[PDB]
Amino acid sequence: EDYSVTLQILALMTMLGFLPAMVILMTSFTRIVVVMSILRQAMGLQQTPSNQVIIGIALFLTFFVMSPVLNEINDKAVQPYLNEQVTAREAFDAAQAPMKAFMLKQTRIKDLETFVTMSGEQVDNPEDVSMAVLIPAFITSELKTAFQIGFMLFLPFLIIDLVVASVLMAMGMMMLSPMIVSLPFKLMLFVLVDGWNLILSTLAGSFA
Amino acid sequence: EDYSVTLQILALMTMLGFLPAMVILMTSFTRIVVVMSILRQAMGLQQTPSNQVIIGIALFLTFFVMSPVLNEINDKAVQPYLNEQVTAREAFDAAQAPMKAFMLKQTRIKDLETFVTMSGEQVDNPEDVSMAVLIPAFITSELKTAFQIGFMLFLPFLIIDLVVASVLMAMGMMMLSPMIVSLPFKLMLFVLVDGWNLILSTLAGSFA
């Protein structure tokens, strides 16, 4: 007794309503956005890359890295559903399973441990936990992971900033602001290292 | 086979809704704004040019450099469609192609390779790659190219500032901030060389 067609449409329209929530919480969008935010503030440029471009890059990146799970949903939950092979209730479960598996690969056991105790449910295996518990654990792990990557990328720009300030202080020109002179070198290092292609490749490879 | 009048209208309104995205992700708007962002940051003025006029000049600059491609879209796609020479499906493809060609002229081979492997698809010719994968490669190349131009624009202003600081220190006045003295010199040398006209030539002509 699968859900009637009227209820099936009502469920799907509700999922489209929560589409921003699914992208910003259940996907890779948050980690990429935060790492780009740290990198932008690491250099002297405040909002030169602009917010729309940063989100635009992240949206394409989060679509590419989640193409495997997106295809797995299609090949196991959409095509059997359209071919009249699985109950609509079964198809919904078949779509949710790869999404849960992907979120578990990028989560930390400490995050699961605190939220499982917070929910107060007696579950032992770290695979049959509810989405209500998994999603906050996943987004917490993504924020912490983004900070680690953000600190990693920040260090070389801190090195340049300290060197420029030290060299200027060596000549006794303490009045000269190190930030104005430091910025072209920060652009210099990031461009001869091929930073933009490098960071997006690492962010793509990070989700594994 | 061809889309009905009702459906064609729906597609037209949809592209108008995404019009800001097409400007800042497919056209030359991103490179111009980033380069102009460096120019404002290089000089001692922080918000003095203000954000409004920079975007407005960038929009007019884009319409100038996108005029060949926009006219090519007009001739190849709009004119047969208005005269009812071709169907809506092929007219849409005839409009998409000039945009794809322009994005290929402003991208790099390495950037395309990274994203085509990232998408996990099969292709052998760059000319028939999907626009969904070309867009992230296009802007990534645009950001790297803009940083290169901005770095070159930042050097002469760094040159002026370092000279003024050295002169003041050499004269013995270790108490005066170089920024106040250097700012008129940076502005004077920006005007008597007609700096913006030179930047227009190296920015508008950089696409070709």
Binding site: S67, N71, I73, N74, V78 | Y3, S4, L7
Partner: peptide, 21 residues
């Protein structure tokens, strides 16, 4: 695949409109 999902949906709507007209 998933990309063709949107294409199929639009074609069905176009076919339904074409038959209705």
């Amino acid at each position: 695949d998933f990309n063709d999902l949107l294409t199929k949906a639009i074609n069905n709507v176009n076919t339904l409109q074409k038959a209705s007209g």
